């Protein structure tokens, strides 16, 4: 019985085999506008026996669409997109309609690259060989790339409008957001999708438990005094200015920071409000010897922070704080 | 090997009492009384809700149950008022037509079984009109108690749960948003209703101080008194009074405001609305022009570039939701008629009456009565348990009386050239065999004519035109002008009246040229391809069709042209097998002017118990040699007339639909012209001879009985016969051994055997065209009009191809009047042509594999009223 | 008390270790007095919610909790069971992120009791209860964001059908037997044929006749002959 499937698998194995060959004939061809008469009727003719083969079981189903999101995965180059999406949009009502995981794979792989094209086709320029003249002229390169942006909206809208189990969990990059500039344009703000889209943004985004973060809220501009215990006067300790917040794993950071590509990293924690007032304390503190560069890592740190500024507020004040902090020093004595 | 468990199949009806006598009392509206009947009613119920009376417009009558004695209502400080007449009656009435204490008995026992489940609940459930919506929408379903009292004396209930989108709306509605796109109706009486313009104040006024009295009288009739509830929203309506007198509105064009009789302040927490249905063109398949292939080659060809007292009116009357349609959908296109000229209605019901499903069924789908299971748990067991007597359902073995399978009925088709039978259950075959028509070739000349999409349409007509010749079906040899357009294409743009007009021109200057020719080569057709499977476009090309004959035929008559239309979907999608063009090549070959003669027809076989009729037994009995069956139907709205008619092989086939309008000079015209068809097929048979027509949808009215019994005579004998498609009475359906296709979907290793190819005598019997004939112990009452029962109730039931407990399919026969004795002799005589009725419907086009059940002319008579009742018609 | 706990917890993961204390008494306790009052769970919801999630944060406890139902003899009710179900029927609108909580914990438990049951299955019928509350399509993910109206009509559902029409019927037993299938290489319109002669070659030429991909008497092909008048 087996050998039935196995003929069956062979045949669908050949079949992309020469679908494959014919997609990249396309550009290993392209020269003569009557090869390319030939060529249209020629992959428009392929098109119509591969679905009339398709439609009438003579192709194993579920190799071949596993081979299409692979083949829609590891494409490159921007012109055999046209094409490879209109043949996605052939299958399109079998793909998605299935009603890690086995079950609903294709689904979430299917939004997980459609994402990820949309990206890396928002990114740049439409030509990848760069290696011939007068490479670009900005006008058609933007008219192209228009069109591929509004397939691949509709695609996601068409996705997003479709699965009702919606688990667009993604295990490999975790959560940058193109989707909410898509939402925006249709439907003139219908609010069933944007409140699936905070649902989303509560699911799949991966909020940490943030005990800690949730008492953030409260502070406010404060500042700190450190007031010596009784049984500490007796003793003579001295008291440590106290903290809004601890940031510990991060003062831990700091003492094994040098001779390590530390600044690129802390910009993806945004603890700029409370970890960066934190680290002057650090900075202050506790290095005679052991941290030479103490003071100097801590400009670049804030200069850091000061180069990446989207708005006025939290910014400049952020010295005022610090002077703030500088008097209370005088205070304190 | 029918061996089925006749009992624990489960029915619909519940057995409520057990009757042997039943008693009245009708006190007759002696004097013309001031209200005195209509004020003693409600004083009479006022003492205790479990009291059986009901109401003729004026005319009171009580009733009462087995034993107990019938109420006397309290008169008077002296009593001069008796009783008009007393009697009683029992469970064998005059059946084919009800006395009118029967019919208001059962209106009697409705409205109490709905007053007491009313007041039962927690005020939450009104009567609709032969309903119980509640108003909040938990269930957000009509459910419909019927009662009933069967021959023997089982007064029994059914159940029934139409699925209507009835959702009640509120304060938060009266914007345009709502009331642009929904039909309101009042809730305790059943009316339609129009909200009336505002006084200033944003749709909702303050309550007079009078009519607050009606909100008591909410109190003794419906039970659902909210004079407690301290707020209350009030509201101006006025209703259509055609609908207080049956006449419901023209359905194509529902949501126009009429004229009015006088406002009314009526209660907004009981106020109900029906959406209207929308439709769409389609999904999935990019309708912003990417799945267009030259979308994609117009990209890479710009990458190529680039690479260089005012109220009891309404709290008495009742609408019995027969009167109110299913659906209504939005865009209600316009076709125009003379008033001799019945000619584009005739060929949008020509061309949608026989396409399989490529039209798509282009409106909204259907909204049936979906089936019970069981009602152990609720409150309605504890309502009836505590009213009643008992409360148990009807088990199989109580109401069939007759089960039994049917055969398999067999059709003529050509192998090589001999002229074999052959099951009926081998169409999809008919490529892999080569089978061909038995009655000879029709052929023709084609013209695609498209205009959206020139480069799928060019491989699309060859290859039609190919697979039409490729099986002896005729030549038709496409057609070819001058120039160089591919033959059998005009490729134009902006379909209108001058190009139109030129097209006339190069058609009839194509005919000029060929002029000396035999009568039978030159039928031409058109196919056109529409851009959205709807009606509004169905329509304006059956508009383009019209012109382009009406400017042929004047510059040259006996040129006939005739109009196909095929989806664009089906020409431009690519898993459209090869395998399945066949079936629409078949669907111009059941058009060409041979109209009367199609693919096949039953094949008369010899029958399989001779029985030689000697001396009879003499009583007035028949035995009839040629059957005659005839399908008619009428709308909702009383303007559209269906009809189709044909032999009991299926040979003499008529399908035609006549819009009667408002008038009822027409409608005797067309009453008239389908008596007429009858007749005119009924000369040319042996003799004793009776026809059958069937009644669609449940209900006949007493104007159709008073017209079909006017024609009738000793020119032939009738038969009239209800027929009832949606399962109002549902038989669900709960064994796991008689049906021998269960356990090879239970598991699919069950049965699972070797066929034992030695005793290779076996036959490939598809199911859903296996059908069971059952013939029920009593009459059952029709699904609709309370005015007239039955006798020998019958159906036809097609199985579920699944494992387990589910409703099974039927088809309700309900004979009225037959014309010999030994009606059940003349049931078993119906349903015997019937199943070979339904088995033809497959080699027509009228339906893909989906009902094997229906009959072919009543399911082409439902075809017409499901799609073509929506347009809405001027007369110029 | 969150940040020791969490301290604790975080540690345990680290520890590579699921074992916990066991106090079933006291979340129990807690449970059945937040579903108690609504306006109870509505004050201080998110100091009650964390600490919840925390303690079913492990799948210890619970898989321990699964064990006992199946222990347990005949249908008795349980006690975390039911003060699940009270708190999802009761937590509603509480905060957007205490509904995804419940949400995950709920479907969390419907997956631990998949994974017991891979043995030989132990009946519980309180899956049906719990699958019903969370789903992620439809009107149920609306959902998350009755007096004495019991009809109890029970309606029937649409039940998927099958998708193979053709069967046999064996008409010797008078049963059916088995699903018709051919791969669909097999229906090809066939041309080599020898059927080019006349009919009445000899008697019975069936043999040159009933050639094509499926045998004629699997629809009791009658042939017609009658001498014609």
């Given at each position: 019985?087996?050998i ?16 494959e060959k014919?997609?990249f004939?396309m550009?290993?061809?392209?020269n003569?506008?009557?090869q390319?008469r ?12 591969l679905g ?14 596993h ?28 793909i ?8 609903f794979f ?5 939004t ?8 890396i ?9 760069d290696?011939?003249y ?8 933007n ?5 591929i ?17 919606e ?12 989707k ?9 703000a ?21 005990l ?5 809220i ?8 450190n007031?010596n215990?009784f049984q ?18 991060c ?13 690129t ?6 603890y ?8 002057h ?6 290095l005679?010897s ?9 400009y670049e ?33 | ?6 009992e ?20 007759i ?12 009613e409600?004083?009479?119920?006022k ?13 009171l ?13 309290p008169?008077?400080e002296?009593?001069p ?8 009656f029992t ?16 209106k ?7 007053i007491?489940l009313?007041?039962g ?16 929408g938990?269930?957000?379903?009509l459910v419909?108690?019927?009662?009933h ?8 209930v ?9 959702v009640?709306?509120?304060?938060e ?9 929904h039909a309101?109706?009042?809730?305790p ?12 104040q ?12 009606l ?44 004229l009015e009789?006088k406002?009314?302040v009526?209660?907004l927490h ?19 022009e ?7 080659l ?5 990458f ?10 309404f ?6 939701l027969?009167?109110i349609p299913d ?11 003379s ?8 060929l949008?019901?020509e ?14 789908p ?18 009836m ?8 359902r009807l088990?199989?073995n109580?109401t ?5 399978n049917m055969k ?8 090589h050239?001999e002229?074999?039978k052959?099951?009926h259950?081998?169409?999809?075959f008919?490529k892999?065999?080569?089978?061909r028509?038995?009655?000879?070739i ?35 040899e496409?057609l ?18 001058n ?6 021109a ?18 031409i ?18 508009n ?5 004959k ?7 008559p006996?040129i006939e ?13 690519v898993l ?7 079936n ?9 002017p ?32 040629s ?11 009383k303007e ?24 009822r ?7 008239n012209?389908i ?5 005119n ?17 449940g ?11 006017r024609?009738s005579?000793?020119?032939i004998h ?18 796991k ?12 290793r ?10 290779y ?7 859903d065209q ?7 112990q009593?009459?059952?009452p029709?699904?609709?009009?309370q ?6 109730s ?9 494992d ?9 026969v ?6 010999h004795?030994?009606?059940?002799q003349?049931?078993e ?9 339904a ?24 075809k ?7 347009t ?5 | 008390?969150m940040?020791?706990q ?8 680290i ?6 204390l ?8 807690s ?7 609504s ?10 919610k964390?600490?919840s ?7 210890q406890?619970?898989i ?11 249908f008795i009710?349980?006690?975390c ?9 009761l ?16 479907a969390?438990?419907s997956?631990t ?12 019928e309180?899956?049906?209860?719990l699958?019903?509350?969370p ?14 109206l019991?009809?109890?009509?029970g309606?029937?559902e649409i039940?998927?059908?099958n998708e193979?029409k ?12 088995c ?7 097999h229906?090809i ?18 043999t ?22």
């Open positions: 019985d087996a039935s499937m196995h003929l069956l698998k062979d045949w669908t194995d050949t079949f992309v085999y020469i679908l014919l997609i004939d550009t290993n061809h392209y003569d506008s009557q390319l030939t060529w249209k009727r020629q992959i428009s003719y392929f098109l119509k026996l009339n083969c398709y439609s009438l079981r003579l192709i194993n189903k579920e190799i071949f669409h081979w299409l999101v692979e083949f829609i995965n590891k494409m490159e180059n921007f012109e055999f997109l046209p094409l490879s999406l209109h043949i996605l949009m052939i299958f399109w009502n079998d998605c309609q299935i009603d890690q995981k086995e079950p294709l689904v979430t792989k299917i997980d690259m459609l994402l990820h094209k949309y990206y086709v928002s990114s740049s320029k439409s030509m990848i060989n290696e011939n007068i490479i670009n002229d900005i006008k058609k390169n008219k192209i790339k228009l069109n942006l509004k397939i691949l909206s509709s695609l996601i809208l068409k996705i997003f409008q479709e699965q009702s189990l688990v667009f969990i993604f295990p490999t990059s975790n959560w940058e957001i193109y909410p500039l898509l939402f925006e344009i249709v439907s003139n219908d609010t069933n999708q944007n409140s699936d889209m905070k649902k989303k943004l509560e699911l799949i985004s991966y909020r940490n438990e943030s800690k973060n949730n008492s953030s409260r502070n406010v501009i404060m500042s700190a005094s007031a215990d500490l006067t007796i003793v003579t300790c001295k008291q440590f200015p106290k903290l809004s917040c601890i940031q510990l794993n003062i831990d950071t700091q003492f094994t920071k040098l001779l390590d590509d530390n600044p990293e802390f910009d993806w924690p945004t700029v409000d409370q970890n960066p007032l934190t680290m304390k650090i900075i202050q503190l506790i005679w052991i941290h030479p560069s103490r003071q100097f890592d801590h740190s804030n200069q850091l922070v000061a180069k990446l500024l989207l708005l006025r507020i939290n910014s400049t004040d952020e010295d005022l704080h610090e002077f703030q902090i500088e008097d209370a020093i005088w205070s304190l004595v | 090997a029918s061996t089925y468990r006749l624990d199949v489960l029915s619909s009806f519940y057995r409520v009492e057990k009757i042997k006598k039943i008693n009245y009392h009708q006190y509206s002696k004097a013309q009384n001031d209200q005195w009947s209509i004020q003693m409600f004083m009479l119920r003492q205790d809700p479990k009291t059986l009376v009901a109401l003729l417009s004026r005319d009558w009580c009733f009462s149950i087995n034993d107990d004695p019938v109420p006397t209502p008169a008077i002296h009593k008022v008796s009783p008009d007449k007393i009697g009683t469970a064998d009435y005059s059946k084919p037509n009800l006395p009118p204490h029967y019919a208001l008995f059962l009697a026992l409705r409205r109490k079984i709905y007491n009313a007041l609940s927690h005020n939450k459930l009104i009567q609709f009109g032969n309903a119980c919506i509640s108003l909040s938990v269930p957000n379903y419909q108690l019927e009662p009292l069967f021959v023997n004396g089982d007064l029994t059914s159940l029934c749960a139409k699925n209507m989108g009835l009640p709306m509120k304060e509605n009266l914007e345009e948003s709502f009331l642009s796109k309101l109706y009042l809730a009486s059943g009316i339609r209703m129009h909200l009336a313009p505002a006084s200033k944003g749709y909702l006024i303050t309550p007079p101080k009078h009519t607050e009295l909100l008591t009288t909410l109190s003794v009739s419906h039970g659902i008194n909210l004079q407690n509830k301290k707020n209350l929203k009030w509201v101006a309506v006025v209703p259509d009074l055609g609908h207080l007198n049956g006449h419901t509105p023209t359905i194509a064009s529902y949501l126009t405001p009429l009789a406002k009314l009526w209660p009981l106020i109900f609305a029906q959406p209207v249905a929308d439709i769409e063109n389609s999904t999935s398949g990019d309708p912003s990417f799945h267009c292939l030259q979308d994609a117009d990209a890479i060809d710009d190529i570039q680039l690479k260089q007292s005012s109220s009891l009116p709290l008495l009357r009742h609408m019995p027969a009167s659906i209504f959908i939005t865009p209600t296109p316009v076709v125009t008629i008033e001799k000229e019945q000619d584009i209605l005739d949008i019901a061309q949608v009456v026989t396409d399989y499903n490529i039209l798509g069924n282009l409106g909204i259907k909204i049936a009565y979906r089936g019970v299971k069981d009602c152990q748990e609720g409150l309605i067991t504890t309502t348990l505590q009213l009643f007597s008992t409360f148990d088990n199989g109580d069939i009386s007759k089960f039994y398999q009925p067999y059709v003529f088709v050509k192998k050239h002229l074999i052959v099951k259950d081998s169409q999809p008919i892999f065999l080569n089978f028509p038995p009655n000879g029709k052929n023709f000349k084609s013209l695609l004519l498209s205009s959206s999409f020139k480069e799928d349409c060019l491989s699309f007509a060859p290859t039609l035109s190919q697979t039409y010749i490729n099986q002896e079906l005729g030549f038709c496409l070819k002008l001058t120039n160089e357009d591919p033959p059998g294409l005009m490729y134009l743009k902006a379909f209108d009246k190009k139109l007009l030129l097209l006339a190069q058609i009839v200057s194509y005919c000029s040229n060929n002029k000396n020719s035999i009568k039978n080569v030159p039928p057709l058109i196919i056109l391809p529409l851009d959205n499977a709807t009606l509004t476009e169905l329509v304006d090309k059956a383009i069709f019209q012109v382009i009406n400017e042929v035929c004047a510059k040259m006996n042209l005739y109009l196909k239309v095929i989806p664009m979907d089906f020409i431009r999608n459209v097998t090869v395998d399945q063009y066949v629409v090549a078949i669907s111009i070959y059941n058009m060409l041979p109209k009367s003669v199609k693919f096949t027809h039953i094949a008369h076989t010899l029958p399989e118990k001779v029985n030689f009729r000697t001396m009879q037994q003499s009583s007035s009995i028949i035995y009839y040699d059957y005659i069956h005839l399908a008619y139907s009428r709308s909702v709205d559209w007339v269906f009809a189709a008619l044909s032999d009991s092989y299926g040979q003499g086939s008529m399908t035609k639909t006549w819009y009667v309008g408002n008038s000079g027409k409608f005797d015209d067309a009453c012209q008596w007429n068809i009858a007749l097929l009924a000369s040319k048979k042996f003799g004793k001879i009776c026809l059958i027509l069937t009644r669609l949808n209900i006949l009215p007493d104007d159709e009985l008073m017209n079909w019994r024609l005579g000793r020119n009738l038969a009239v016969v209800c027929v009832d498609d949606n399962s109002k009475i549902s038989f669900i359906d709960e064994d051994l008689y049906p021998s296709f269960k356990p090879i979907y239970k598991d699919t069950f049965g699972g055997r070797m066929d034992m190819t030695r005793l005598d076996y036959e490939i019997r598809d199911i296996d059908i069971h004939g059952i013939v029920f009593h009459p059952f029709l699904a609709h009009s005015h007239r029962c039955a006798i020998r019958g159906a036809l039931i097609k199985f579920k191809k699944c387990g407990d589910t409703v099974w399919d039927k088809f309700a309900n004979l009225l009047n037959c014309p004795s030994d009606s059940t003349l049931l005589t119906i349903l015997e042509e019937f199943r070979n009725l088995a033809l419907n497959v080699w027509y086009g009228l339906s893909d594999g989906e009902d094997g059940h229906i009959p072919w002319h009543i399911l082409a008579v439902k017409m009223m499901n799609t073509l009742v929506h809405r018609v001027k007369i110029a | 008390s940040r020791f969490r301290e604790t917890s975080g540690m345990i993961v520890s590579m270790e699921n074992y916990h066991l106090i079933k008494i006291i979340r129990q306790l449970e059945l007095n937040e579903g108690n009052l306006k109870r769970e509505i004050q201080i919801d998110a100091v009650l964390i600490f999630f925390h303690q079913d944060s492990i799948f406890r619970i321990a909790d699964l064990s006992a139902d199946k222990p347990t003899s005949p009710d349980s006690i069971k039911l003060f699940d179900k009270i708190s999802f029927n937590r509603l609108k509480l905060f957007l992120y205490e509904i995804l909580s419940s949400l995950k914990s709920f969390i438990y997956s009791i998949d994974a017991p049951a891979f043995h030989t299955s132990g009946k519980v309180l899956p049906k209860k699958l019903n509350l789903p992620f399509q439809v009107s149920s993910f609306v959902k998350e964001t009755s007096f004495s019991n009809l109890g009509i309606i029937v039940a998927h059908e193979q053709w069967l046999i019927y064996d008409k010797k037993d008078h049963k059916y037997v699903t018709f299938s051919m791969e669909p290489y229906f319109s066939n041309y080599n044929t020898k059927y080019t002669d006349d009919m009445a070659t000899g008697s019975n030429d069936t040159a006749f009933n050639d094509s991909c499926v045998n004629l008497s699997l629809f009791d092909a009658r042939f017609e002959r009658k001498n014609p008048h």
